Design a protein around this ligand. Structure first.
Ligand SMILES: [Zn+2]
Ligand SMILES: [Zn+2]
Lengths: 659, 647
RNA sequence: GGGCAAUGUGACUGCAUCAGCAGUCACAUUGCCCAAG
RNA sequence: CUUGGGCAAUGUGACUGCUGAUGCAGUCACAUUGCCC
C-alpha cells in the first residue's frame, strides 16, 4: 500500500525508514519560482553494508516532474565497485510549461502549478532506510549561456561539484543568435570526471535504437581540461544544446592511482563559454606564405638563368615507381572516409587535438595544424620542376640525380598530404603518418649522396626505403603499450647501422683512410642515440624513428662534405651558406618537433590535460613551427646536395673521386 | 495532489482521465501467481490529433515493480513519425522473491495544464516464447514455427547458459513478411534502456534490423563473460534504418517469425579442409615430369634484391593492418552488427564467424609459393629462346600470395570500409599476364610495370567505392574503361607497324570485346558494382591470350602438348571460376537489413558456399593461366633471339 | 576479532559578509486611432 | 488641448528565494593511543 508524503519546498534531507512492500511517493509543489531550475536528486542507503549479500537492485527512486524523468536503480555497479548512492538531473520546466500570464500572480481564472513526483521502491521483504537529497540549481546557473550585446565569453569560477551533485547548462542558439561555440573546462585537482553534451530534444539516460552508431551525444573524460566545439553545421542542425558535467568515483578510465575519498571528493571546475564568429585567417597565413617564399630567392642567381642558357621518356615514365604513392594516399582516403562518415560529436570525442589554441576554420578544428603544411607542398612541387627543367653532356660532371630528385619532390608533397590528413583527426589509429615521409626523404638524400659518384641512382631504392619506414612505424605503433618497444627499436636500429657499415666496407676495400673513421663515427653516434632513446623518458615513441633517420641523414651528408673537402675539391660559397642554413634549419625543426608531447600510452583524459599555448599571432603553436621549419630544412638540404657537386661539371667522368 | 488507484488482476485495459496538474499512481498487487511472467505496460493518448500542436512530451508513465523499472515519455518520436503509443517490458520477479507480496507502481504524470485522457494496457508472456531455451540431455537444436510478433506484443527470451551448460550458441530467425523488425540482446545483469557513463564505450547490446533474416552468434568469450543472456525481437515502427521508403510505413501489422536455437560445440573441419588441399594438389600433376626434371638436368643478386619493387606489398599489408585493428578493438557485441557475412554458409571456427571463406584462401598462398620458386629455380641459352620471364613471375607469385592476405581478412568480416580488397589483387594478376606476354619477345619485362598497374587498379577500386552510393557510377566505369582500352589498342599499332592483317584485326577485338562488356553491365543490373572492374580485367587477359595463343600459331609456330592441355583448362577454370564469383550479390548500396536477408545455402559438404569456391577456383585459373604463359613458347627454346618473329 | 574517548582528514544540514537570477506591488514618460462634446 | 481607461518596454528602487566563496559552531565516516570482561 502506497504512502504519499508531502515534501516541503525548503527541506533537502528526507530520511524515511521505508517499510516492507511499501512504496513511498514524495511530492513537491512546483511554482512560478522553478522555471529553468535544474532539479537534481540524490538517494542513498543507510548502513549500506547490511545488504552486502543481496545482489542487483535494492532501492528504486524514479524522479519525475512532467517534462522529464529518470530512475536510480541503487546500488549502482561500476567496473571497479558498487556504490550505494548516485545523483541524476532533470530537464527543468520552462515558462511555457505552466502557462503565460499577464499580472495578479495567478489572478484566479486558472490555478496551474506543476508537481515533482519522487517515487521509492524495494525488492526486499525487509525494511530499508534511504536519504533522498533533493536540491536545485536556480536559473542563475542553468540557462546561464545567455549573452548580452557585445559580449563573447562568459566565465564562471570554481563551480564546486561532487559525485552526487553534477552541473548542467542550456545552450540555445537560435533563440540567442549564435554561430560557433567553444567551451573550456579548467580544473586543478586530478579527479576524473565526464563532460557530456546532448541536443535539447534528446535525453542522456535513455538508451537509443542502435545507439553506438545513432549517437549525437559526446562524452569526454577529463581531469585538468576538456574542450568542446559546436561547429556551424552542428548548430544549424540541432539549434540547442545541453551541456552537462557529471563526475565519477574512481580514476579507472582516467588513471591508475585512485583518489582516496570514494565518491566523496569535491573537485573545482571553471568554464569558458566563448561565442566565436567565422573568420578566414588571411593575415596569419600572410606572414607564413611570404616567409615560405623568401628562401626561393636561391633560384634567381643560379637556376632560372641556367634554364635560359638552354633556350626514352616513355621508358622512364613507365619505370618510375609510382606505387610509392599508395601508402599515403590510402591512409588519407581512409582518414577522410572515417572523418566525414562520423557523427558530429564522435569527432570531438575521438580527435585529440591541441585544443589549447587549435584555431578552427569552419568544419575543421585545427586550421593552423593543417595549412601550415603548405610549406612542404610548395617546396615539393619545386623539385619536381627543377629536375625536369634542367635534365640536360653525359661525359663530364657526376651522374644525373634526376629521378631521385623527382622522388624527393613527390615525397615532399606526400608529406604534406599525410600531415594534413593526420592533423584532421589525430586519434591513435594504427598508423601515424606524420613524419614517415620526412623519414623517407631523409633516407633518399642519403641514397642520392651514396650513389651520385657511382651511377645514376635508381628510384627503385625508394621501394625498400619506404617498406622499411612503413613497417618500422606500424611496429612502433602496435608495440607501444608494452615495455620492450624501445628495445625493439634499439635492436632494429643496430641491425640497420651494422648493415650500412658492411655495405660501406664491401664497396671500397676497407681503406683506413675512410672506413676506419667512418664506421667508428657512425657506430659511436648511433650508440649514443640508442642510449638517449632507450634510457630517457623524453623521446616518445613517435619521435625516435624520425630522430634516428634525420640523424643518419645529417651524419652521412656531413661525411660527404668532409670527404669532398679532404680530397681538396672546391665547395662554392653558396654551397657553404646552404649547408649552414640547412644545419640550423634542421636544428630549429628539432627543437620544435621535440615538444610534440603526444603519446597514446596514456589514457584519454591524460592526453586532453595537455595544453601547450601558441606563440605568434594566436595562430602559430609549436607543432606548426615544426611543420614550417621542417619544410625549410628539407629545401635547404636538397639545395645543398644539388649544389655541392656543381663545381665539378667541368671534370671528366673518369678522374672523379669515387666515394 | 496524487490519486491512488488499486487495480486487481482482472483489468487489462485501464482507461482513466487526468485532471490538471494531477498525478495518478496505480498498483496491481503481485503474488506467486506472477513469477516469471514477462509483462508489458503500454500507454496511449486518446484524441491524439487534438494535441498535435503541443511540442515535446505529454505523459510520463513510469512503470516500476522493484526489480525492473522503466519510463514512457509519450509520444515517443521517430525520424519519420510520432507514435502516440508505446510499450516496454519488465524483467519478471524471481522465485526467490517469495502476508508477503510484491507490487507494481505505475506513476502517470502530465505536463499539460489542460486535462488529458489516457489508457493503460498490461500484457503477459510466459511458459512459451520465454523460458523456452531449456535444453534436454544431448539436445543441440530447438525450434519454433510461425511465432506471432506484433508491435503490441514483442517476444522475449531468456538464455541461462550457466545452468544449460553451453559453450557456443547460435540463433537464427527465418521469416517471410517484408516487415521491419529489431533484435536486441543484453547481458543478464544489464537492462535495455538504461545508459551510464561511457555506456556506448561498453555497449554490449546488439541491434540487428532484420526484414527477412538475422543471426546471433554467442561466442566462447561471450558466454564466459556474462553467463546469462536476454533476447527480444521487437517491431520497429518505421522502415528508415531497415528499408528505403515510406511505402506502407503507416501500419501496426502482425508478423510471423521462426527460430532455430543451435547449441554448437567448437570443432575443426578436418574432413572438408583436407578434401580441399588434396583438390589443390592434384591439378599440380603438370609439374611432375617437367619443371623438377630440368633442374636435375641443370645441376645482380645484391642489386636486384634492391631494384625489385617491394613497395607494391604495402597497398595490402597496410589495409589488412587495419581490418585487424578494427576486428580486435571492436566490442564483443559490435561484431555481430557491423560484419555482414552470408550466414547460410558461414561455418565458424574458434572465434571467427566464417572459416569457410578464410581457410579456402589457402589455395592462393599455396599457389603462390610455387610461382615464387618455380620461377627463381627455373632460369639457370641466354641468347636462345624468348627472354627469361623469371623476375616478373616473382611478382605474379607475390601478388598471388598477397591476394591470400587482402582476401582472407576481408572475409574476417566485411564492413563497408572505403577499400574492398577482395578482387583488387586478382585484377592485377590478370593484368600482369598481359604485360608479361606483351614484352615477352622484346626484352626481359621489368617488374616495375606494376608500379603503374597497381595504382591503376587501386584507384579504380577506390573510385568505385567512393561513388558507390550515387546513381551515375556505372557511367564512370564506362569512361575510365574506354580510355585505357583505347590506349592499349593505340599502344599496339605504334609498336608493330600498323599491319592491318595483324593490328586492324587486333583492335577489332578490344573494340568489340570491351564494348560488348560495357553494355552488358551499363544497361543490365546483374553485374553488381564491385564485380565489374574484375570482369573487365580477366577479359582483357583472356582476349590477350586467345590472341597470343593465335599470333603464335598464326605465324606458323608449334605449341607443345602440355601447353595445349594447360591453357585449355584455364579457359575451363576462368569460366567456372566466374560463375561462382557471378553470385556474390554483396551490394553495399542497399540497407543494412536486406544485406542480411541474403542466404545462399552451402553447395558441397555443408562447408562450401558459392562465394567460397570463387576463392578456390580463382586459384586454378590463377595457376593454369600461369603455367600456360611459361610453357607456351618452350618450343622456341632452341631458336636464337634473332630468328624469332616479334609481336 | 569488539566498543568507547581523543588525533587528524573527507563529506553534510541548517546561521552569519558578497555575487548573478527570478518573482511581487507601486512610480514616471511616451505615442496611438476609433467614440463623443 | 485636458482628463478617464488600454498597450508596451526601457530603466528606478522595495521585498522574497536559489546557487557558488571566506570564516562560525555542530552531526556522519576512516587510521593511532589508552581501557575492558
Ligand atoms: Zn604534423
Ligand atoms: Zn572473398
Amino acid at each position: 500500500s502506497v504512502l504519499v508524503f508531502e515534501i516541503s519546498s525548503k527541506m533537502k534531507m528526507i530520511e524515511k525508514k521505508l517499510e516492507a512492500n511499501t512504496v513511498h511517493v514524495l511530492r513537491l509543489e512546483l511554482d512560478q519560482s522553478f522555471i529553468l531550475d535544474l532539479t537534481k536528486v540524490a538517494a542513498e542507503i543507510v548502513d549500506s553494508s547490511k545488504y552486502s549479500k543481496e545482489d542487483g537492485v535494492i532501492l528504486e527512486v524514479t524522479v519525475s516532474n512532467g517534462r522529464d524523468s529518470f530512475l536510480l536503480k541503487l546500488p549502482t555497479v561500476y567496473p571497479n565497485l558498487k556504490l550505494y548512492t548516485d545523483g541524476k538531473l532533470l530537464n527543468p520546466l520552462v515558462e511555457q510549461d505552466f502557462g503565460a500570464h499577464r499580472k495578479r500572480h495567478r489572478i484566479g481564472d486558472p490555478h496551474f502549478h506543476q508537481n515533482l513526483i519522487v517515487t521509492v521502491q524495494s525488492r526486499l521483504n525487509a525494511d530499508i532506510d534511504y536519504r533522498l537529497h533533493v536540491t536545485h540549481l536556480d536559473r542563475a546557473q542553468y540557462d546561464f549561456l545567455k549573452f548580452k550585446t557585445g559580449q563573447t565569453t562568459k566565465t564562471l569560477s570554481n563551480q564546486k561539484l561532487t559525485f552526487v551533485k553534477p552541473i548542467g547548462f542550456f545552450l540555445n542558439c537560435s533563440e540567442q543568435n549564435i554561430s560557433q561555440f567553444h567551451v573550456t573546462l579548467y580544473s586543478e585537482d586530478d579527479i576524473c570526471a565526464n563532460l557530456i553534451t546532448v541536443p535539447a530534444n534528446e535525453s542522456i539516460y535513455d538508451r537509443s535504437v542502435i545507439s553506438d552508431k545513432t549517437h549525437n551525444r559526446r562524452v569526454l573524460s577529463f581531469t585538468k581540461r576538456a574542450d568542446i566545439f559546436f561547429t556551424e553545421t552542428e548548430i544549424s542542425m540541432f539549434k540547442s544544446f545541453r551541456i552537462f558535467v557529471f563526475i565519477a568515483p574512481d580514476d579507472s578510465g582516467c588513471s591508475t592511482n585512485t583518489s582516496r575519498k570514494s565518491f566523496n571528493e569535491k573537485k573545482k571546475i571553471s568554464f569558458e563559454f566563448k561565442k566565436l564568429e567565422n573568420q578566414s585567417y588571411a593575415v596569419p597565413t600572410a606572414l607564413m606564405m611570404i616567409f615560405l617564399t623568401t628562401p626561393c630567392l636561391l633560384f634567381l642567381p643560379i637556376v632560372i638563368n641556367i634554364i635560359k642558357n638552354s633556350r626514352s621518356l616513355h621508358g622512364q615514365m613507365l619505370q618510375y615507381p609510382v606505387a610509392i604513392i599508395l601508402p599515403v594516399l590510402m591512409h588519407t582516403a581512409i582518414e577522410f572516409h572515417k572523418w566525414t562518415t562520423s557523427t558530429m560529436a564522435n569527432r570531438d570525442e575521438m580527435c585529440f587535438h591541441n585544443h589549447a589554441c587549435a584555431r578552427p576554420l569552419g568544419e575543421l578544428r585545427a586550421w593552423n595544424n593543417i595549412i601550415t603544411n603548405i610549406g612542404y607542398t610548395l617546396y615539393g612541387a619545386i623539385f619536381i620542376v627543377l629536375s625536369i627543367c634542367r635534365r640536360g653532356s653525359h661525359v663530364f660532371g657526376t651522374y644525373e640525380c634526376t629521378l631521385l630528385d623527382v622522388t624527393i619532390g613527390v615525397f615532399m608533397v606526400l608529406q604534406s598530404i599525410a600531415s594534413a590528413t593526420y592533423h584532421i583527426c589525430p586519434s591513435d589509429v594504427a598508423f601515424q603518418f606524420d613524419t614517415p615521409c620526412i623519414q623517407v626523404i631523409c633516407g633518399l638524400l642519403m641514397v642520392r649522396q651514396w650513389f651520385v659518384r657511382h651511377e645514376s641512382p635508381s628510384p627503385a631504392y625508394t621501394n625498400i626505403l619506404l617498406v622499411g619506414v612503413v613497417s618500422l612505424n606500424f611496429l612502433i605503433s602496435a608495440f607501444s603499450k608494452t615495455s620492450y618497444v624501445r628495445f625493439i627499436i634499439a635492436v632494429i636500429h643496430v641491425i640497420v647501422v651494422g648493415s650500412i657499415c658492411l655495405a660501406k666496407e664491401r664497396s671500397l676495400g676497407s681503406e683506413k683512410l675512410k672506413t676506419r673513421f667512418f664506421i667508428m663515427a657512425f657506430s659511436m653516434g648511433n650508440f649514443a642515440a640508442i642510449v638517449m632513446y632507450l634510457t630517457l623518458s623524453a623521446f616518445h615513441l613517435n619521435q625516435i624513428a624520425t630522430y634516428c633517420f634525420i640523424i643518419n641523414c645529417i651524419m652521412y651528408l656531413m661525411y660527404y662534405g668532409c670527404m669532398k673537402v679532404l680530397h681538396s675539391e672546391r665547395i662554392t660559397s653558396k654551397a657553404k651558406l646552404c649547408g649552414a642554413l640547412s644545419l640550423l634549419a634542421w636544428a630549429v625543426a628539432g627543437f620544435f618537433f621535440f615538444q610534440d608531447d603526444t603519446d597514446w600510452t596514456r589514457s584519454a583524459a591524460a592526453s586532453r590535460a595537455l595544453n601547450k599555448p601558441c606563440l605568434l599571432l594566436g595562430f602559430f603553436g609549436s607543432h606548426d613551427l615544426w611543420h614550417i621549419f621542417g619544410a625549410l630544412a628539407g629545401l635547404f638540404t636538397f639545395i645543398f646536395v644539388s649544389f655541392v657537386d656543381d663545381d665539378l661539371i667541368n671534370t671528366r667522368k673518369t678522374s672523379i673521386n669515387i666515394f
